Structure formats: C-alpha cells, structure tokens
Design a protein around this ligand. Structure first.
Ligand SMILES: CCCCCCCCCCCCCCCC(=O)O
Ligand SMILES: CCCCCCCCCCCCCCCC(=O)O
Ligand SMILES: Oc1nc(Br)nc2nc[nH]c12
Ligand SMILES: Oc1nc(Br)nc2nc[nH]c12
Lengths: 346, 346
C-alpha cells in the first residue's frame, strides 16, 4: 500500500547519531517519540538544550522528541520499537532491563525494528538474531541502506530498505518509517540476513578503503574494492542461509558504496593511517566499527569455510601487524582470473 | 593462464585521455606503440613535446609511444588494435580509412579491443557492434571498468574487465593488457553487451548524480541513484540479449559508482547546473557524454519497451526543459514499493 501510517508513540533504544537521526524521522510520523539513553543526567541535559549534544551535534531535536533514562517510560504506549543499542550491550540490555519491555512487546504485538549493526563476539550472531532470542521473530524487522546520520537527521533525501521474513511485516514498517515529504523512503525486502551481513562487513571493507588511500591508490582502486568486497558479502550471506536479494540493493551495494567513500569516517581514517604505516597501537585514540568487527567476522567466516579475501587481509593488517603492501601483493597473488559473476539471463 | 604476454607492436585508434592512458599501459607491454591522431601537425607536436598536450595534459608519454596521422603506419605490424575513436566517427573511420586496416586485421587475425563507448544515433547500435559490421566478431573484445584516465596513465591501481563472446579470447587479451607490476589488472567475462550498456548508461546516470547535488541532495541520495540506476542497466541489458554477468561487476557497478562520484566530471557539472536551475542552452560552453547519449538511449529503450525511470527523467530534464524538482517528484510518484531484486540463493 502506498498510504502512510502515523502513530501516537515511538521509542528508540540507542542514543547515537543514527538512532537520534531515526527519531527525527519518527518525530514527523509519531505524535510522541522517546529516545532511551541510560545516563539520567544526560537525559535531562539533552532535553533542556533541545539537542542531542552528545552524538548528533548541531541538530535541533523536533520538540516532540524526549530523551528518557527510564526504560519503563520509554516503551509504555510505544507503537513501534527501534533498537540501535550497540551489539556488545544488546544481550545485557535484554537480560538486565528488557523484562517488562519484552512482555509488553509480546502482549501488544509491537513491531520491532532492528538498526543495530555488527557481530557479537561470544556467539558470532547478528543483532536481529540476538534480539530474536528475546522476541518472537514475527515482530522483527531490519533497517539498512545508505544513510549518513546527519543527512537523515536533517531530512536530506535518503532511501533505506526494511527487511522482514514476512514481506508483509516489512511493508507495514515501510508505511510507518516513510515520511510525508518523501524525504525518507523505505523499500521492502525479505533478505534479513543479507541486510545484516552487508551492514557488518561494510565497516570492515571501509577500513580497506582507507588502506587503499593511505597506500597512494585512487578512485579506480576504491571502486574495485567495493565491487570485489560485495562478492564477499554475497558469499557470507549464502553460507548463513540468506536469499541474497538485499546484496545488490540498498542494504548491500548502496550502503557499501557510501560507507567506503566516507573519507572522514573513522573506519576510513584508521585504514588510511594503517595505510601510511602507522601501527594500530599508535592509532587508537572512540573505536572504529570495522576494527572491532574484523575479528569475529574472520572467526565466523572460518567456521563456515567462506573465503573472504579482502576481509582477511584487512583483518591481518589490523590484528597481526601485516604490511599493507605485503597484503595487497598477496591479495593479487591469485593470478589472472575470470570476473566470476553468474549470468542473470540465460 | 596467469602468465603475461608481451608484443612487438600495438596501435591505438583514438587520441583521447582514455586511449592515450591505455597506450601507457601498452607501452609497458609492447616494444612499440603507435597512437593514431588525424591532424598531422598535432601528431608532430605531441611527438616533439613527448606529451599529449592535447587531451592528457601533465603526463609523460613513455618514449616508445609515437603519435601518427597515417592509418597505414599506425597498424602495420600491430599485434593488437584498440579502438577508442568516438562513436559518432566510428563508422565513417571504417568507411573512409579502414579498408587496408580491415583486410590486415582479418588476414593476420589481429585481436581488436573496443574501448569506445556510447550509442550511435542512426542505428542505435553500440561501439563493438558497429565495429563488428566491419570486422569478424571472433577478433573482437570489449574493455570496461572503473578507470579514470589520469590514474590509468600514471600507473595507479586499476582493475577493468575485458569481455568477449569466447571467454578464451578475453583471457588472451587479459594477458596482453595486464601490466608486469600488477598496476593494471584485467578480469575476464563474456558479457560484451552488459559491458557496452553499462558504459553508455553510466554517462546518463552521471548527469543525474549532478542533478541530485544541484538539487541540494547529499551522499545518501547519490548512493540510491547508483543502486536504482543499475537496475536500469540490468533491464536494458536483458532486452538486448546480454547474459548480464558484467552488470554487478567492474563494467557495471564498478564503473557506475566511479563515474557518478566524479564531482569534477563534465557529466556531473552539467547535471549540477541543471539542478541549480540553469537552462541547458545557458550551460553548453565540449559536450558531455551523457547529454549526447540520453536521446538515443531513450529511443532505444522505447523501441525495446524497457522502463528506465531515472534515465527518462534525466532525458526530460536535458531535452525538454523539465524542472528537476518536478522530475524528482514524478520519479517518486510510484508509491511504496518492494526493492524488486531476485534472490540469489533459493
Ligand atoms: C587489507 C588489504 C586492503 C588493500 C586495499 C586494496 C585496494 C583495492 C584492491 C581491490 C583489488 C581486489 C583484489 C581481489 C583479488 C582476489 O579476488 O583474490
Ligand atoms: C532526472 C532525475 C534525477 C533526480 C535525481 C534523484 C536523486 C537520487 C534519486 C534516487 C531515488 C530513486 C527513485 C526510484 C523511483 C522508481 O523506481 O520509480
Ligand atoms: O553497560 C552498558 N549498557 C548499555 Br545498554 N549501554 C552502554 N554504554 C556504555 N556502557 C553501556
Ligand atoms: O571526421 C572525423 N573523424 C574522426 Br576519426 N575524428 C574526428 N574528430 C573530429 N572530426 C573527426
């Protein structure tokens, strides 16, 4: 259906640049929107300054956005729930504070939208999969696509995709997240897995992009990194059970191309230093997503016997003091190959 | 085979930034390399200055590169032929000067490499297809991929793909074009058509990229343009008979992502002005590829009944004084949709 849905309330768990930006979209589709941040003092500050001076500096919170540190106040009444809490704290949030939240969600069949990205080290599971150990899969959807937070927060044209096992769940979320001025447009897909794989691997690939640049390479190089890197997202996706339809779409190619040209992103800058030769120890001074993700990503790949050439060489560069140039050459040690893509049309 | 081939001679027909840059690659794989430019006086100049001051300013021609205006001197001995002559003059070159060249190519089974890009207005045929009316298809290959000329000319890491009906022809060209230092790496594919479609349509899409920017949009937008734009390349490719395997590869996604972020490209700048509202008449002051290509591209699409939403709206903006904002809204008039990509894995 091409007709939008407006609600009375929405809560967002995660007070980062991304969740905050997402609350601005919701603020235009929901009467009320709470954003859950844990530090009570910060909650008040932000509410006073009418601005998340914490993670999205320079943006003016809609007046109907209210930060709260009380989980219970956050979800009560909410007709949509967004999770954007970082991977590492996800499970612990659910164990230590999700009790009432879970029961509420189950009782009222409240749609849940996963926006957290990564791989959990202990289990090597993805964010929606974790959340799925606490909440029935049918209530769950995943949001992914090229979406720089500032741009999303200030209403500049953005297209993301929403994925759910049941397309019909995605289509209903598509109608709650899409704005009235067509500035935030959601496309439906069923590929939850491809979405989550693309989201996680893009951050690792994005350090490679930095590596390339620090190494003296240019735009031809980066384009080739995005293209080959995508095959790695596609193969890991196949192995994990996904149907792969998100791979060449917004969640995959779209978010991947974006994240890799983000020259001022911390993923890029870190790779760029490693590229220039600076040791990782010297660098770290606010961790980069790709750095944290490379390790688990590598363990998961190994466990599933998926070859991910770019992601391994990026992992070695980051974790095992491998010379970027030695890495590049090894990557190119393969010899002359076929492009390796299947025909679309027989 | 992962082992390279070096030759005694190579000729390149086309004295642009691209062919000139390609001659620098060849100059490292061929004893001798002639580059055919028509103006005899210019030929001498360039040869004296040891630099194509004409279209690739600031680059030092290998010493084994010699410009010549004598077709006959150009190909005699050549063991590979590259065409990079612009589309519009392609046929006329073959009719007015290819006589001896054609016979020579046929007689010695000289591999031909098509690097020209576009759609010929009269026939709506692509460059390799044209050349195929004068030369047996088996001798023909197509080169495509993300490859900014300066970067290719100065040896900065570049990956392109080479396509031929027979993969084995592509693999042999792959071994002649790939350099000894792995700075120019060629991947083989059979998708000649997808390659040529991607090459032509990317220039039109690249004006859209400019439109987006002139309209105030940012990087999220551009990423979404690249992703949806690609479907248009895929659908036109299906209709023309291609197997589509080049689409999500170097020739497609790769070259597309590159060409659309080329903020200083004439395709971008033109779109950007149209975006800012400047009338096309006011703009033109050296035509942009996408401008010339939009018309034929639109006629070809129509003739084949392929819907190419972005390319049509770009055509209207360029040829029919359509307001970019009116265009954007119409493009978004579709309503809430599914992403529309097939599963890769069943
Ligand atoms: C950690 C290594 C990153 C180095 C950055 C490389 C710059 C872009 C390289 C892209 C070339 C792709 C190589 C693919 C080779 C293969 O498939 O085995
Ligand atoms: C000539 C029009 C160009 C306007 C530039 C638009 C900026 C990026 C827009 C990408 C959104 C893709 C819209 C697809 C809608 C559809 O499939 O019908
Ligand atoms: O322990 C923690 N839980 C959550 Br939820 N978020 C955090 N941020 C820092 N420490 C944290
Ligand atoms: O007529 C022409 N033929 C070729 Br080949 N190239 C050209 N460039 C300008 N006019 C030309």
């Amino acid at each position: 259906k091409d007709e939008l849905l407006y609600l009375n309330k929405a809560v967002v768990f995660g007070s980062g640049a991304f969740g905050t930006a997402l609350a601005m979209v919701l603020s235009k589709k929901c009467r009320e929107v709470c954003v859950w941040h844990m530090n009570e003092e910060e909650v008040r500050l932000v509410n006073e300054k009418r601005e998340n001076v914490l993670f999205l500096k320079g943006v003016q919170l809609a007046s109907n956005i209210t930060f709260t540190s009380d989980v219970e106040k956050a979800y009560n009444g909410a007709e949509i729930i967004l999770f954007v809490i970082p991977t590492q704290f996800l499970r612990g949030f659910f164990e230590k504070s999700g009790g009432n939240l879970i029961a509420y969600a189950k009782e009222k069949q409240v749609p849940v939208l996963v926006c957290t990205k990564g791989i959990e080290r202990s289990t090597l599971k993805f964010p929606a999969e974790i959340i799925g150990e606490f909440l029935p899969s049918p209530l769950l959807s995943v949001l992914a696509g090229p979406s720089f937070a500032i741009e999303v927060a200030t209403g500049v044209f953005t297209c993301v995709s929403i994925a759910s096992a049941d397309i019909n769940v995605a289509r209903r979320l598509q109608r709650i997240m899409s704005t009235g001025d067509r500035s935030f447009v959601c496309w439906a897909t069923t590929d939850t897995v491809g979405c989550e794989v693309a989201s996680a691997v893009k951050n690792v690939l994005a350090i490679g992009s930095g590596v390339a640049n620090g190494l003296g390479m240019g735009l031809n190089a980066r384009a080739a990194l995005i293209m080959r890197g995508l095959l790695e997202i596609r193969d890991l996706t196949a192995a994990l059970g996904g149907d792969g339809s998100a791979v060449f779409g917004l969640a995959g190619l779209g978010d991947l191309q974006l994240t890799c040209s983000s020259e001022l992103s911390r993923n890029f800058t870190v790779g760029k230093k490693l590229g220039k030769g600076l040791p990782i120890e010297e660098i770290q001074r606010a961790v980069a997503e790709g750095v944290a993700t490379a390790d688990p990503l590598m363990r998961l790949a190994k466990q599933l016997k998926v070859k991910m050439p770019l992601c391994h060489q990026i992992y070695e560069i980051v974790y095992k003091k491998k010379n970027p140039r030695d890495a590049l050459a090894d990557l190119l040690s393969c010899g002359l190959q076929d492009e390796g893509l299947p025909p679309l049309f027989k």
